Amino acid sequence: PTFYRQELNKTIWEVPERYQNLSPVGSGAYGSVCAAFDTKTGHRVAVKKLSRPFQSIIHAKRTYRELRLLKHMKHENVIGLLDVFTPARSLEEFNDVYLVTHLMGADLNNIVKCQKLTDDHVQFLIYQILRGLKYIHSADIIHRDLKPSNLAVNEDSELKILDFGLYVATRWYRAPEIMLNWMHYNQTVDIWSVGCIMAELLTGRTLFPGTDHIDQLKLILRLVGTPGAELLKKISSESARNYIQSLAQMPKMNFANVFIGANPLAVDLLEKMLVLDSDKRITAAQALAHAYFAQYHDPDDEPVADPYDQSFESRDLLIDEWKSLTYDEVISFVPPPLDQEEME
Ligand SMILES: C[C@]1(C(=O)NC[C@]2(N)[C@@H]3C[C@H]4C[C@@H](C3)C[C@@H]2C4)CN(S(=O)(=O)c2ccc(N3C(=O)CCC3=O)nc2)CCO1
Ligand SMILES: Nc1nccc(-c2c(-c3ccc(F)cc3)ncn2C2CCNCC2)n1
Ligand SMILES: [Ca+2]
Ligand SMILES: [Ca+2]
Ligand SMILES: [Ca+2]
Ligand SMILES: [Ca+2]
Ligand SMILES: [Cl-]
């Protein structure tokens, strides 16, 4: 392909002539994103230019990580790849990586903020998050920072999870075991996040808007109740355990007295997601079977992922080795068919 250059976000982008009318649509993880028109297919796409992908061993491995992950993700509610390109003609010239996915116009914050959502619409939004989570979790991939700004949505409320498996960030949706660095966690960290998101879709208000990690924990405990001694097992810091243990005991609230006028099935699902005991938290696959989603649930259309080889994560390699592996993954990429779906 012939490439052209255009200054976007104060830096030069070099992209194939296939992609036209680039326009900035915000930052991404380790990069920045432009909307574009794919002249090959007439489809709208989003192109992410990674920022300094091989500047350091940290950038280089995270570039490889992200490319490997996105090449593996093939699910309608998870960001995956239509294309990946570089202006480099050889490994020796290779210093820039661009990732292409279908364009999604907004994030979940754009949906709820100016819109009184119906319960049927909330069901659809949460259903899609859970469908995507079932898929990524089945490949032993966890998001760990799921939140409305990491949920891409389009003009028809179709939703995809992004920035999974990888500046002041909001902590309001993080699982307590993540926010407080507890010693053990599982895939259900993301289910806590879904509960926080769903609660906000039902009320219009952030569920746990803490000003710091201690304020947020206090808000959490007011809803779910003081934890038992067994939960302290997970907390390394003695000062943290002593503090939590010292707090005045609080009962769990009945969520039916919290989410007023909500579908009782929504309240029941929230009770199963917003539990401190991550071994008692509902899984994504279990949640998809909950009656709240009855009108959407379809077991034939809730697939799992192919096995995902993450052995590279334990390895320390040199920058040029991560760079060469990344180049290999660029070159071996096989674009998917434009139409990959059929009537049920
Ligand atoms: C959850 C809620 C709320 O108490 N927030 C305070 C807390 N953050 C605080 C105190 C305890 C424990 C912790 C710390 C978590 C919360 C509860 C509820 N209020 S509402 O009552 O004004 C309302 C507002 C809306 C709705 N609604 C509908 O209108 C339809 C469905 C639905 O849920 N239902 C209720 C708005 C703000 O968000
Ligand atoms: N508009 C749009 N549409 C799809 C994806 C993105 C996108 C990507 C991204 C990831 C991989 C890829 F290959 C291409 C783009 N990273 C962050 N975002 C946006 C997510 C919503 N807030 C603005 C940034 N943005
Ligand atoms: Ca119940
Ligand atoms: Ca169906
Ligand atoms: Ca088709
Ligand atoms: Ca079927
Ligand atoms: Cl967010």
CA dist 206 and 197 (Å) reads: 8
CA dist 250 and 244 (Å) reads: 12
Nearest CA to ligand 1 atom 25: 203
CA dist 1 and 164 (Å) reads: 31
Sequence-distant (≥ 6) Cβ neighbours of residue 77 within 8 angstroms: 128, 129, 131, 132, 135, 159, 160, 161
Could you tell me the distance, in angstroms and rounded to a whole number, from the CA of residue 154 to the centre of ligand 1?
27
CA dist 247 and 239 (Å) reads: 13
CA dist 186 and 97 (Å) reads: 32
Task: With H, G, I as helix, E, B as strand and everything else as coil, classify residue 45.
Answer: strand
Cβ contact 20:37 at 8 Å: yes
CA dist 172 and 212 (Å) reads: 10
Element holding 66 (H helix, E strand): helix 57-72
Pocket probe mutation, ligand 1, options 122, 126, 259, 270, max atoms within 8 Å of Cβ: 259
CA dist 11 and 50 (Å) reads: 12
DSSP code, position 200: H
**In this structure, how many other beta carbons lie within 10 angstroms of the beta carbon of residue 185?**
17
Fold of 106-293: Transferase(Phosphotransferase); domain 1 (1.10.510)
CA dist 307 and 299 (Å) reads: 20
Sequence-distant (≥ 6) Cβ neighbours of residue 45 within 8 angstroms: 19, 35, 36, 37, 38, 82, 83, 100, 101, 102, 103
What tokens were used for 28? 């991404």
First to last CA, the chain: 38
CA dist 20 and 264 (Å) reads: 48
CB 100 less than 6 A from any atom of ligand 2? yes
**In this structure, how many other beta carbons lie within 10 angstroms of the beta carbon of residue 139?**
19
190 is annotated as an active-site residue: no
From 77, 90, 60, select the one nearest 136 (Cα to Cα): 77
**In this structure, how many other beta carbons lie within 10 angstroms of the beta carbon of residue 202?**
23
Phi first, then psi: give them for residue 176, nearest 5 degrees.
-55, -40
CA dist 86 and 88 (Å) reads: 5
DSSP per position, 229-251: HHHHTT---HHHHHHHHHSPP-P
Element holding 83 (H helix, E strand): strand 83-85
